[PDB]
């Protein structure tokens, strides 16, 4: 009803007067073009507006209209296998409507398809008392994901009318007899992205996620509902790590958010994923994948919207009972958007110009992930695993974004530029990296493998830690200065890195390694050190062990390529290697 009047336009920041009836965090349309924007500040009749589109050609005197509703997302069928932008606008539909290969402004389109017919299957009986979270029916959206129609929050009553049939997301499918009267539900619900979806309670993420990455699943594991960060210099392999996880994970659904990165990387995912196969089900990856894209040359403020759009959708399928993995690539561009807006509002700068509430914004995001008990009488269980990339300037991890992140996340996959320039991928620094789940996962892995696996990993890091300490002495003196005991430790430490840690993602077989395979592969590596340590203790020379076990190494260094269904070949080596030394 009340029409605002622009008095200032500076970048993505727009101020307007006569906005006394407006509210904080409400959406408003700015200028004659009516571009999408959000109110972030209010000073009497003057409001400060954060615009998620280009503000070029917009000046003072132009009108501004409030919508009265916060930044929200449409939640329902027609959301999977789709690519939306920062504020959840269908990019494929945007291309059709505007008849353009480029991105225009001031064009409002519904997030989902409001004309497409879906088959709703009523599974609840009429006369049932329900509340928020309860399932009333479902739609087989994909072969992987069964879209469960849940009772929206703020709705409680008795199911009067419901039946199966072909409906759209606008058609009333169920009638609820509430207190305020009669209410009709649809297959679609709205929800504000800045507010985390309510649950019954949070739980501890104790089930480790199978990433198929040796360095990750072994030494720095992340659990279903965990939170991991991947800081590193450019070209270190953040996008690849997140891509590998997005295509080999143990979870049910994957949400990949391209936050301020390359457009081609988003195009690449759309093209290749339908050709690949889901580990869990056996169908195509795109049937469990939701893509959110706001590139680096796209509106800066929309980078923040892209993050909250992704986590909200993740929470949506979480309440259905699914395990969702959300990828933030990368969270640094999110921080840059906040820094830009902070400067526009003339706030007090923190470290490197970032807002002093940066660490709090990050905390809000990561605390929305985790294993929870969803609302509803069923008390079903869902989870959200957050895998975020950090892009520090110059590779310096003492930067504001990385440091604030490591205070709330539990897993730190630090990428080393020196390893990347050694063709050592993934470039994860085993010395500086860590995982707070390593102990708990270890006991889980012990029980699920029925071996002393936790002792193997502990032994594994003890060697690598010793190697770093030894390399300081190796830096000064030659190769014939260390003891046979010291020399053995270095030869088996080099094995861990080359045979196990290094993993090519572009190799059909090496791109994935099952939990079963990681066990047998690591055992033949540690058996080498043990049987050789016993040899040294009884008089055998280090050199004599080297030239005498050449052919045995070749089998171990080749073990990362052996087919999953032919795992016996790796296990057999353990007998052979011990017998190869037993030959002398």
């Amino acid at each position: 009803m009340q029409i605002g009047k622009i008095i200032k336009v500076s970048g993505p920041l727009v101020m307007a007067e006569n906005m006394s009836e407006a509210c904080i965090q409400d959406m408003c349309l700015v200028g004659d073009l009516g571009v999408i924007g959000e109110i972030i500040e209010m000073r009497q009749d003057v409001a400060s507006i954060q615009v998620y589109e280009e503000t070029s050609g917009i000046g003072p005197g132009e009108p501004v209209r409030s919508t009265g509703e916060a930044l929200s997302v449409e939640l329902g069928p027609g959301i999977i296998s789709q690519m939306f932008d920062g504020i959840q606008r269908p990019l494929d539909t945007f291309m059709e409507v505007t008849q353009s290969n480029f991105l225009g402004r001031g064009v409002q389109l519904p997030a989902l398809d409001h004309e497409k017919q879906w088959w709703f299957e009523a599974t609840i009986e009429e006369g049932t008392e329900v509340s928020a979270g309860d399932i009333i029916g479902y739609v087989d959206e994909t072969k992987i994901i069964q879209h469960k129609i849940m009772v929206p929050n703020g709705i409680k009553g008795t199911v009067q009318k419901i039946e199966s049939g072909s409906f759209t997301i606008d058609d009333p499918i169920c009638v609820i007899e509430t207190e305020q009267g009669l209410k009709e539900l649809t297959m679609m619900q709205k929800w504000p992205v800045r507010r985390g979806r309510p649950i019954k309670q949070k739980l501890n993420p104790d089930v480790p996620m199978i990433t198929g990455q040796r360095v990750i699943d072994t030494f720095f594991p992340v659990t279903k509902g965990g939170a991991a960060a991947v800081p590193g210099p450019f070209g270190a392999g953040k996008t690849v790590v997140q891509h590998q996880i997005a295509k080999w994970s143990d979870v049910d659904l994957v949400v990949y958010v391209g936050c301020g990165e390359r457009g081609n990387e988003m195009t690449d995912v759309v093209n290749e994923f339908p050709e690949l196969i889901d580990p869990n089900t056996g169908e195509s990856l795109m049937e469990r994948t939701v893509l959110i894209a706001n590139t680096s040359n796209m509106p800066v403020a929309a980078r923040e919207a892209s993050i909250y759009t992704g986590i909200t959708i993740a929470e949506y399928f979480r309440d259905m009972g699914y395990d969702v993995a959300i990828m933030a690539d990368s969270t640094s561009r999110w921080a840059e958007a906040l820094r830009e807006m902070s400067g526009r509002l003339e706030e007090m700068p923190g470290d490197e110009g970032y807002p002093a509430y940066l660490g709090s914004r990050l905390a809000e995001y990561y605390e929305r992930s985790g294993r929870v008990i969803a609302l509803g009488s069923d008390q079903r269980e869902g989870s959200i695993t957050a895998i975020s990339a950090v892009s520090p300037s110059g590779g310096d991890i003492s930067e504001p974004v990385t440091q604030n992140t490591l205070r709330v996340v539990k897993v730190f996959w630090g990428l080393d530029s020196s390893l990347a320039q050694k063709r050592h991928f993934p470039s994860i620094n085993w010395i500086q990296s860590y995982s707070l789940y390593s102990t708990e996962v270890g006991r889980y892995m012990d029980q699920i493998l029925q071996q002393d696996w936790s002792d193997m990993v502990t032994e594994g890091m003890r060697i690598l830690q010793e190697e770093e300490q030894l390399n300081e002495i190796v830096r000064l003196v030659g190769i014939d200065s260390l003891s046979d005991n010291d020399r053995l430790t270095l030869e088996v430490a080099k094995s861990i890195r080359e045979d196990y840690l290094q993993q090519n993602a572009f190799d059909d077989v090496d791109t994935f390694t099952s939990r079963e395979k990681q066990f047998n592969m690591l055992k033949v590596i540690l058996t080498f050190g043990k049987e050789a340590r016993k040899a040294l203790s009884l008089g055998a020379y280090f050199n004599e062990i080297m030239e005498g076990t050449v052919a045995v190494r070749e089998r171990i260094s080749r073990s990362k390529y052996i087919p999953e269904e032919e795992l016996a070949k790796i296990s057999s080596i353990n007998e052979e290697i011990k017998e190869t030394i037993q030959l002398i």
Binding site: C23, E41, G350, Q403, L436, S481
Partner: protein, 446 residues
């Protein structure tokens, strides 16, 4: 009445008799009630920050009432066994506590001459502490950790195994979680229940996604409860706070809200005062039965000892307990490095009548032998490690057995002071009697 709503902040006009850090109450246009706290107040207006945030607040149709009082704690003996918020609100689905009275969370400043000598021994059950860096009643002994280091388990192990021998009259443990994740918070709350340590403890849990003003009020809330149990109820109170780094970071946000120019390394200039105001709420007091003992826990950014947070803390606390990344990567639990660690009051809690008469000497013996054994290992790596002294060779094997058997006891292993000292002798029994710094009358323990 509301003039401006800028982010989490708010500008309220028509303020009169409004004091600093006074609580407010907001009645929104839809009937939702939220509370806040005055961060800055003038004649015409006042700046407040809402606990529940400012999202969805209509500036025109919202009202604000001032409560005329700051944050208060409803203290009572019924606090024992209860888990609270960072604001002192019940977090454990239990009955609301009928308060004996309401107290300020800022407390009072202890007179420098009103303090007593630290006297009694506190058995943490951890050999690296009780023996080499002994915790004493009234002492401020902090733990310096880092990102990824198991200070979580160490905090849980101390709060679980800590006991006073032999006098077991009114010993309590006040635990304060500051701006940590829910996982770490749930880990603590679950461990206190499963072990039964909840029956004698008080908890104040503050989360990472809680507003920065709640994170700042958390240590003041816990210490007020502690000093209540200590001074008014004569209880022996041990206080554990983590993470103190989160507290310092929270100050930066509020300081920026008041538009204050940051000091060294980005922190407010009055950081020194704030930490000292919290930590010095401890020590034995002349003419008072109960006391407050503190174990502040903090993570050093980038493992930097020169960082303001651990550097200022050392100027306040009597020593420190260092956790290193090297020992953690080696599998040492707890990863306590005894060389850079220190307890400045350990001699006040050892000797005879407390622990055992062979406490001090073996400590100096284990320390000297571990340092020398640690150095002998360095020579081995660079030299042949084959022609080193026969006595030196034992030192190397001693230093290894000292880290893997003595320091690495486990996160769920409780050692009595006697068991700790006995194991120390079995380690010192590796070396000949000619290489000891213990007296000849210490041949009763061999």
């Amino acid at each position: 009445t509301i003039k401006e709503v800028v982010g989490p902040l708010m500008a309220v006009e028509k303020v009169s008799g409004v004091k600093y850090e006074e609580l407010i109450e907001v009645r929104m246009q839809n009937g939702e009630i939220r509370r806040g706290q005055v961060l800055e107040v003038q004649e015409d207006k006042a700046m407040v920050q809402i606990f529940e945030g400012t999202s969805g607040i209509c500036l025109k149709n919202s009202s604000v009432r001032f409560l005329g009082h700051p944050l208060q704690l409803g203290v009572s003996e019924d606090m024992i066994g209860r888990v609270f918020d960072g604001l002192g609100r019940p977090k454990d689905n239990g009955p609301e506590i009928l308060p004996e009275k309401y107290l300020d969370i800022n407390g009072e400043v202890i007179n420098p001459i009103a303090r007593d000598y630290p006297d009694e021994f506190i058995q943490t059950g951890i050999s690296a502490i009780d023996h080499l860096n002994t915790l004493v009643r009234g002492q401020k002994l902090p733990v310096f950790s880092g990102s990824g280091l198991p200070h979580k388990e160490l905090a849980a192990q101390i709060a679980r195994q800590a006991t006073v021998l032999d006098s077991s009259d009114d010993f309590a443990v006040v635990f304060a979680a500051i701006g940590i994740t829910f996982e770490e918070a749930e880990f603590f709350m679950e461990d206190f229940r499963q072990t039964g340590a909840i029956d004698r403890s008080v908890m104040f849990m503050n989360l990472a996604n809680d507003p920065a003003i709640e994170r700042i009020a958390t240590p003041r809330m816990a210490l007020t409860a502690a000093e209540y149990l200590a001074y008014e109820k004569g209880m022996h109170v041990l206080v554990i706070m983590t993470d103190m780094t989160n507290y310092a970071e929270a100050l930066r946000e509020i300081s920026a809200a008041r538009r204050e120019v940051p000091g060294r390394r980005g922190y407010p200039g009055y950081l020194y005062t704030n930490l000292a105001t919290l930590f010095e709420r401890a020590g034995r007091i002349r003419g008072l039965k109960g006391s407050v003992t503190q174990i502040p826990i903090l993570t050093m950014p980038e493992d930097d000892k020169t960082h303001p947070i651990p550097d200022l803390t050392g100027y306040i606390t009597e020593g420190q307990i260092i956790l290193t990344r090297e020992l953690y990567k080696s599998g040492i639990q707890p990863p306590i490095d005894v060389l850079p660690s220190l307890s400045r009051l350990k001699d006040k809690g050892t000797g005879a009548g407390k622990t055992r008469e062979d406490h001090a000497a073996t400590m100096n013996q284990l320390f000297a032998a571990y340092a020398q054994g640690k150095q002998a290992k360095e020579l081995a790596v660079v030299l042949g490690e084959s022609a080193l002294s026969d006595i030196d060779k034992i030192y190397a094997k001693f230093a290894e057995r000292f880290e893997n058997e003595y320091v690495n006891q486990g996160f769920y292993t409780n050692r009595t002071i006697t068991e700790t000292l006995d194991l120390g002798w079995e380690l010192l029994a590796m070396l000949p009697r000619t290489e000891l710094k213990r007296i000849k009358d210490d041949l009763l323990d061999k």
